[PDB]
Amino acid sequence: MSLRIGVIGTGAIGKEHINRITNKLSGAEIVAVTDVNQEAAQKVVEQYQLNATVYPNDDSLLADENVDAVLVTSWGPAHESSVLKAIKAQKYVFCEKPLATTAEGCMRIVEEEIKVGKRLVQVGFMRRYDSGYVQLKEALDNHVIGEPLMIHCAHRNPTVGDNYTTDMAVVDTLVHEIDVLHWLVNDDYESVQVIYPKKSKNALPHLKDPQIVVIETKGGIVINAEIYVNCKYGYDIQCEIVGEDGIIKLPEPSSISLRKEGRFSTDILMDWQRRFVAAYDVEIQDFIDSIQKKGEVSGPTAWDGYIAAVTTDACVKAQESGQKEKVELKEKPEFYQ
Amino acid sequence: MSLRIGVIGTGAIGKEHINRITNKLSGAEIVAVTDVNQEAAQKVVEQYQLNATVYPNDDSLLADENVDAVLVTSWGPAHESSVLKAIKAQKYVFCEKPLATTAEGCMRIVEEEIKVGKRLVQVGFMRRYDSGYVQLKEALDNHVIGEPLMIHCAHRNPTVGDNYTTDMAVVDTLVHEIDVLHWLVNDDYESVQVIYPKKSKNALPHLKDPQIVVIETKGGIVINAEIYVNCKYGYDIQCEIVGEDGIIKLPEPSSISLRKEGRFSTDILMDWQRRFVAAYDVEIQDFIDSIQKKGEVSGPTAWDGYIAAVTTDACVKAQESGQKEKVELKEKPEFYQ
Amino acid sequence: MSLRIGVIGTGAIGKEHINRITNKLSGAEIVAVTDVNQEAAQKVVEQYQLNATVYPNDDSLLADENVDAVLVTSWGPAHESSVLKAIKAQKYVFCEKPLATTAEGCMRIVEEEIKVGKRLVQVGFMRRYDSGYVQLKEALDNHVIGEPLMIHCAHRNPTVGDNYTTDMAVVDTLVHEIDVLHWLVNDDYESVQVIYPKKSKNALPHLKDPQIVVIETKGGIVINAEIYVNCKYGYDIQCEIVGEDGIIKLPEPSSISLRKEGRFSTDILMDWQRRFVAAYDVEIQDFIDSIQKKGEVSGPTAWDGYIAAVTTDACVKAQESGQKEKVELKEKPEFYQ
Amino acid sequence: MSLRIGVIGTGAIGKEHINRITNKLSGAEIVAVTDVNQEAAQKVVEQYQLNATVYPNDDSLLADENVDAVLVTSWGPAHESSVLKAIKAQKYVFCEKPLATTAEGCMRIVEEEIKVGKRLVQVGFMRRYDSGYVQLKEALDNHVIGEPLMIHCAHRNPTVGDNYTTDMAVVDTLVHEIDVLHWLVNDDYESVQVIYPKKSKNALPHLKDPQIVVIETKGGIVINAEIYVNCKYGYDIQCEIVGEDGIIKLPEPSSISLRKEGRFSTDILMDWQRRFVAAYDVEIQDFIDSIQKKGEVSGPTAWDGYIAAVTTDACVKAQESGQKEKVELKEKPEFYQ
Numbered sequence A, B, C, D: 001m002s003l004r005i006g007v008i009g010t011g012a013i014g015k016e017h018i019n020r021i022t023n024k025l026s027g028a029e030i031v032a033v034t035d036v037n038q039e040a041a042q043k044v045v046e047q048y049q050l051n052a053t054v055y056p057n058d059d060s061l062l063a064d065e066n067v068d069a070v071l072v073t074s075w076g077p078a079h080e081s082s083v084l085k086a087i088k089a090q091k092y093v094f095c096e097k098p099l100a101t102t103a104e105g106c107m108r109i110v111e112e113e114i115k116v117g118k119r120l121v122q123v124g125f126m127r128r129y130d131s132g133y134v135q136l137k138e139a140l141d142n143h144v145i146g147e148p149l150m151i152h153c154a155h156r157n158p159t160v161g162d163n164y165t166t167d168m169a170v171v172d173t174l175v176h177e178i179d180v181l182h183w184l185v186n187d188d189y190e191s192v193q194v195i196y197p198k199k200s201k202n203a204l205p206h207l208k209d210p211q212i213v214v215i216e217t218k219g220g221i222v223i224n225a226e227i228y229v230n231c232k233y234g235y236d237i238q239c240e241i242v243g244e245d246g247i248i249k250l251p252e253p254s255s256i257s258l259r260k261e262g263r264f265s266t267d268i269l270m271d272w273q274r275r276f277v278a279a280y281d282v283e284i285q286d287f288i289d290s291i292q293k294k295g296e297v298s299g300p301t302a303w304d305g306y307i308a309a310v311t312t313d314a315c316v317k318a319q320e321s322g323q324k325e326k327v328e329l330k331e332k333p334e335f336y337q
C-alpha cells in the first residue's frame, strides 16, 4: 500500500520529481497536482499518464484526503505559504529550497511544526545524499583527520541567464554549501564576510561575479567559498576540508580518462542537472521509505532551512556593506535533537 | 498496473534482486518464488513481507498465470533447465550468468527463442549498465579514439574461498569481461590463449593464480586480461582501450582523497558486492521498463550468453593445453540484429 | 675561464650551495669564504677540498680581487650589511632571503644598486625556477585561462621547532608565495588581512597555527593563502589560479602510485629540503651562466626583495590588528624594466 | 683536477653529451673528439669553444694520453669496433646503445673487460637514473608489494620516420625496457613471443605497428609490453608492476593541471628528447663522479648490454616466426657481482 503524493508546483523541477517518483523510485504515486498555470499542471498530468486530480490551488489540494504528503516545488516565494498550510492540514511535506524566502518566514514554519508534535518537514538540500558528501560525513564522524580547521570550496557555473542578480549568488546558489557545510562539521555559523574580486569578462555588468565568502563558525573553523557562475569551462563543485592531522576532499564526478592530442584529460560536466541526479533519487526515496516505516520524515529539518535563511541574510548584508556581518541565530529548540 | 515476477532461486543473489525490486525499483512485484531448500524460499517470503506463492519447483511456478516474468537466479547448473521451460511457458526471463553451463546448452536456448517469435531472454551481464562502461561505449561509438587496436584490463579479487578452482577464473570470473569487451568493440573472438605467471603466495596450491589470457578478435584487436583473485589489496576492475589515435580508460570508483601520514590516497573497495550495485538497479529497471513499454526485453541477448559459453570453453581448453585454442562460433541468426 | 665566488655565511644553506657549485653545477668555483664562527669556515674549506681563502670578515673578502661574485648566505639579519658592502665593492651578489630584515634596509640596497649602474643583486626566491611554477608562468603568459581572478594556495609544514613564532609564518614562510604570486600575475599587492582559525592541537600554545592570509592586488585579484606548519601529514605546497575562462594548478611532486591494503596512494614529502632541490640547482646555475654571458644577474631583483619586505610588514601589522592593513609601495624606479 | 674525456662520434647525441658535460655537469672536460665526417667534428669544437684535439680516428684519439675516458656515441654499428679498442687502450668507456649490433660482438667486449681486470664499460641505459624508475627500484628492494608477478608496460611514439622498420621496434625501441625491466626485478629473461595487432592507419604499410611482446623470466614473472610508435597523441612510457600483495606504477611526467572547455587535463609530451633529459644528466655525472672517486665505472655493465643483444635477437626471431622463441643466455661470469 503506497504513499499518496500531491505536487504543488508543476514546474521544471516539480516535473523532474514527478518523473522520478513515477518511473524510477519505489512505493509512492502522484494523486494530485496544482499549478498556477492551471493548464500547465493539466498538461503535465497527461504527459506522465497520471491518475491524479488537478486542483486550482494548494488549499483545494490540501483539502483532499486521498493525499497524505506533498511536494512543494513551485516558484520560490510561494513556498512558505504552501508549507504552513500543509503543516496544519497534518500532511507530510517535502520542500525544495527555499524553505521560506525570509528568516522569520522560516521561523513561523518551525513553530508550527513544534506544535504538531512530530517531524513532517523535510527540506530538499540533496547534497547530504550525494555519495561523495556522505563519504566526507563518514570520515569526519570517524575522526580520520582530527579536528576540522578550515574549508576551501567552490561552486562554479559555466554561465547564467540575464536574469541572474548579484544576490542570487548567496541566495539561490551558495545555499547548498551553507547547508551541507555546517551539516558536515556540526558547528554553527558565527560570522560571514564578502570580498569581490576583479569582475569577470564573462559576466554581465549588472552582476558581481566572482565573489568570495569567508565564514567563521562558533568553534573556530574558517571557510572560504568561491562562487563563480561565469567560469565558462564547466559546472564544478569542489570542497576540501583541512583537519588537524589530515585532509579530505570531495571527488570529481566519475569519468573516463582520455589520451589524445597531447593532453591526458577527464570530463567536466556542463549541466548542473547532471551533477546530482542520484542525490535526488536517494533523497526522495528516503522521504518515502522514511515516512512509511517511521511515521516521520528524516533529512534536512525545518530548522536546518531556517539556519539557511538567517545565513543568507547575513550574506546579502555583507554583500552591500563589504563588512564582517554577524549571524544571530536563535535558540535551537529541544524539539530538534 | 505493475509487472508480476517470479523468482526461481531464493539464494543470496536472488535475495538481493528481490530486495531491490521490492524496495528500490519501480513498476514490479514478486508474486512467486521457489527454492530447492523450499524452506529457505519460505523464509525469504516472510523476511521481505511479500505477497507471493511458494512453489516446490519451477514447473509449478511457471504453471501459475498471475506471473508474467521470472528471475532465474539459482545455483549455476540448474539455470539452463529453468530457462527452456520458461521460454515454452511464454513468460519473460532474466537470467543471471551462466545462461547455461555448456555452449550447446546455450544453443538449445537460442533455438527455442527464435521459435517463440520474440525476445524474452535477457542475460544478467550488468557491466553494460555501469556508467563508466557506458561512457566507454559512447566514446567508441563516437570514434573519439579511432579504430581500437588493443585492450589491457584486469579483474582482481582480494582473496577467494577454498572452493575456488583453477577454471573458475575463466568460468565464473572472466566471464563479465568476455561479455563486455566484445560488446564494446563490436567484434567476435577469434582465438584465446592462456599464460600462467609465477603462482602467488596468497593462493592455495590447488589453484593457479594469477593467470593471463590473451584474446584476438576477428578484426585484429588484441586483448590481455589479467585475472588475479588473491591480490590481497582489494577488489579492482580495470580496463584500458588503446585506439588508433587515442586511449580511453575505465574510471576508479568515486572516492574522497585523503592526505595523511605521508600518503595522498583514494579508497579501494574490498567487497565485489559494492562495485556494481547501481548497474544491477539499472539493469533490472531496464528489464521492467523495457518489457512494459515494448513487449520485448532489451539487454544482453540469449545469443550474447552463448558467445560467452563458447569462449569460456576455448579458455578452459587453453587452460589445460597452454596452447592457442581456436574459438569456433556458429552463424549469427538473422533473428539477432 | 670560470666565475670566482666568495661565500659569506658558511652555514647549513651556504654549505648546500658550496656543495652544488663544487660538485653539481658548471662554470664556477669557491675561492673565498668567511663565517662569523671563523672556525666553522675553516672546517668547510676542508670538508669540500676547496682552494679558497678564509677571510675574518666580509670586508676582507670583498677586498680580494680574485673574487668577482659572492653568495650572501649567512644569518638572516646580517644580510643587509654584507650586501651593501658588496655592491660598493662592485662584485656580484646572490642573496638568500631575507634581502634585509626591514623594508627601509631593502630600500638602501636598491638606491645603491641604481647608482652602480647595473644589476648585481639576485635574490634567492627559487620558486621561480621550479618546473611547475614555470609551467604556470608560461600558461598565463599565453593567456590560456584569460584574466586571472583568484588564487587559492597553501604552504604546509609537518611540524616546526619550539623556536617557531607566530610571525615567522608571514616572515620566514609565506615569503616565497609573496614573491612568486605577484611574479606570476604581474600585479602589485594592494591590501593584506589575516584570519586565525581554531588553533591546532599540533601547535605549541605560544604559536598561532594555522593562519589564513587574504591579499588583494591593484588589479582586483584575490588570493587566499593557507599557512599551516603543524599539519602533521607532510610538507606540501599547493597553488591554484582561477582565471576568467580556466583553471591551472601546480602539480604534486613526481611519485610512484601504490595499490596496497585498500588504498590507492601517491607519496607526500616530509622534508622541505627535498621539494625544491632542483630549483636551487637551476637558480644558481642561472646566476653563474647569466653573469658570464651578460655582465649582469637575472632572477628576482633587489626590487622584488623590497616588495617582499613591505608586504611582510603589512602582514605582521595585520597579524596584530586582525584588520585590513594597507600595503604602501613606493615608485618602481625606471631602472627596473 | 678534472676528468679528461674524448668523444668518438660527434653526432646529434654525442653533441648533447658534449653540451651537458661542458655547460651543465661537474668535474670533466672534452679534450678530444673524432667523427667520421672529420669536418663535422671541427665545427663542434668551435660550436662549443672546446680546448680539444681533433683526431682522424678512434685509434689516434685512444693513443693520446691526456685523455683518460671516452664517450662512444657514434653510428650504431660502429660502436663495437671503437669500444674494444678503448678497452685495450685501458681508458674508461661510456657507450650509448647499442653496445654491439650483434650478441657475439657484445661477447667479445665482455671477454676483453674480464681480462683488463676492472670495470671500464658503462652502457647508456639512462632509464635506471630516472627518478620514477628509481622509486620503483627502491620500492621493490623494500618488498613493499611482495613477490613481483606480472608487468604491464608500454612505449609509445607519436610517429616515426619513413626510415622506421618493423624490427627497429624491438631493436632501437624496446631495448630500454629490456634493460630496465630485468634490472628492476633482478631476474633473467627465459622466453619471448610477439603478437601483431590490427596494423594501424597511422603507420606506413612497410611497417608492423603496433606490436605486443610477451616475455617470461626464469622466475615466472610475465611481462606484456605494448610498443606503438604511431599512436599520434604523444610520446608516453608506462610501466605497472603487479606484485603478490600490491601494485606500483611509474608516474607521469610532472605537469600543471588545466580546467578549460569541458575537460580537466594534464600535459602529454610530444618529444622523446624531453622525457629523460634529467636521467642523462644524472647518468653522465655518475660516470664522472664514479670514475674519479672509485677507479671504476658503475651503471649498466658490459654484461647488461649483452643481455640486451641476446634478447633483441630472440625478439626479431619471434618477430618472423610469431612463435615462442627461447632466449639462451650464457653463464654470468663471476667477474660481475
Ligand SMILES: NC(=O)C1=CN([C@@H]2O[C@H](COP(=O)(O)OP(=O)(O)OC[C@H]3O[C@H](n4cnc5c(N)ncnc54)[C@H](O)[C@@H]3O)[C@@H](O)[C@H]2O)C=CC1
Pocket (backbone or CB within 6 Å): A008, A009, A010, A011, A012, A013, A014, A034, A035, A036, A037, A040, A057, A058, A073, A074, A075, A076, A078, A079, A082, A096, A097, A098, A172, A272
Ligand atoms: N535551475 C536551478 O539551478 C535550480 C532550480 N531549483 C528550484 O526550482 C524551483 C522553481 O524552478 P523550476 O521548478 O525549475 O521552474 P519553475 O519556475 O517553472 O517552477 C515554478 C513553478 O511553480 C509555480 N508556483 C508557485 N507557487 C505555486 C502555487 N501555490 N500553485 C501552483 N503553482 C505555483 C509556477 O506554477 C511554476 O510553474 C525553485 O525552488 C528553484 O529554487 C532547484 C535547484 C536549482
Ligand SMILES: NC(=O)C1=CN([C@@H]2O[C@H](COP(=O)(O)OP(=O)(O)OC[C@H]3O[C@H](n4cnc5c(N)ncnc54)[C@H](O)[C@@H]3O)[C@@H](O)[C@H]2O)C=CC1
Pocket (backbone or CB within 6 Å): B008, B009, B010, B011, B012, B013, B014, B034, B035, B036, B037, B040, B057, B058, B073, B074, B075, B076, B078, B079, B082, B096, B097, B098, B172, B272
Ligand atoms: N559471489 C559472486 O561473486 C557472484 C555470484 N553470482 C551468481 O549467483 C548465483 C548463485 O549464487 P548465490 O545466489 O549468490 O548463492 P546461492 O548458491 O545460495 O544461490 C543458489 C540458490 O539457487 C539454488 N537453486 C538452483 N536451481 C534451483 C531450482 N530449480 N529451484 C530452486 N532453487 C534452485 C538453491 O536453492 C540456492 O539457494 C550464480 O548464478 C552465481 O554465478 C553472481 C555474480 C557473482
Ligand SMILES: NC(=O)c1ccc[n+]([C@@H]2O[C@H](COP(=O)([O-])OP(=O)(O)OC[C@H]3O[C@@H](n4cnc5c(N)ncnc54)[C@H](O)[C@@H]3O)[C@@H](O)[C@H]2O)c1
Pocket (backbone or CB within 6 Å): C008, C009, C010, C011, C012, C013, C014, C034, C035, C036, C037, C040, C073, C074, C075, C076, C077, C078, C082, C096, C097, C098, C124, C125, C126, C172
Ligand atoms: N632563500 C632560501 O631558500 C633560504 C634557505 C635557508 C635559509 N635562508 C636564510 O639564510 C639564513 C642562514 O641559514 P642556515 O641554514 O645557514 O643556518 P645555520 O644555523 O646552519 O648557520 C647560519 C650560519 O651563518 C653564520 N653567520 C651569521 N652571521 C654571519 C655574518 N655576518 N658573516 C658570516 N657568517 C655569518 C653563522 O656562523 C652560521 O654558521 C637564515 O637566517 C635563513 O632565513 C634562506
Ligand SMILES: NC(=O)c1ccc[n+]([C@@H]2O[C@H](COP(=O)([O-])OP(=O)(O)OC[C@H]3O[C@@H](n4cnc5c(N)ncnc54)[C@H](O)[C@@H]3O)[C@@H](O)[C@H]2O)c1
Pocket (backbone or CB within 6 Å): D008, D009, D010, D011, D012, D013, D014, D034, D035, D036, D037, D040, D073, D074, D075, D076, D077, D078, D082, D096, D097, D098, D124, D125, D126, D172
Ligand atoms: N642510448 C641512447 O639514449 C641513445 C640516444 C640516441 C642515439 N643512440 C645511438 O647512437 C647513435 C648515434 O646517434 P646520433 O643521434 O648522433 O645520429 P646523427 O645522424 O645526428 O649522427 C651520428 C654521428 O656519428 C658519426 N659516426 C658514425 N660512425 C662513426 C665512427 N666510427 N667514428 C666517429 N664518428 C662516427 C657520424 O658522422 C654522425 O655525425 C645511433 O645509431 C643510436 O642508435 C643512443
Ligand SMILES: O=C1[C@@H](O)[C@H](O)[C@@H](O)[C@H](O)[C@H]1O
Pocket (backbone or CB within 6 Å): A157, A172, A173, A174, A175, A176, A272
Ligand atoms: O542551488 C543550485 C542552483 O540555484 C544553481 O542554479 C545550480 O547551478 C547549483 O549548482 C544548484 O546547487
Ligand SMILES: O=C1[C@@H](O)[C@H](O)[C@@H](O)[C@H](O)[C@H]1O
Pocket (backbone or CB within 6 Å): B157, B172, B173, B174, B175, B176, B272
Ligand atoms: O562474475 C563475478 C563473480 O564470479 C566474482 O566472484 C566477482 O568477484 C566478480 O567481480 C564478478 O564480476
Ligand SMILES: O=C1[C@@H](O)[C@H](O)[C@@H](O)[C@H](O)[C@H]1O
Pocket (backbone or CB within 6 Å): C156, C157, C172, C173, C176, C272
Ligand atoms: O624558506 C622556507 C623555509 O623557511 C620554511 O621552513 C619552508 O616551509 C619553506 O618551504 C621554505 O620555502
Ligand SMILES: O=C1[C@@H](O)[C@H](O)[C@@H](O)[C@H](O)[C@H]1O
Pocket (backbone or CB within 6 Å): D156, D157, D172, D173, D176, D272
Ligand atoms: O632510444 C630510444 C629511441 O631510439 C626511441 O625513438 C625512443 O622512442 C625511446 O624512448 C628512446 O629510449
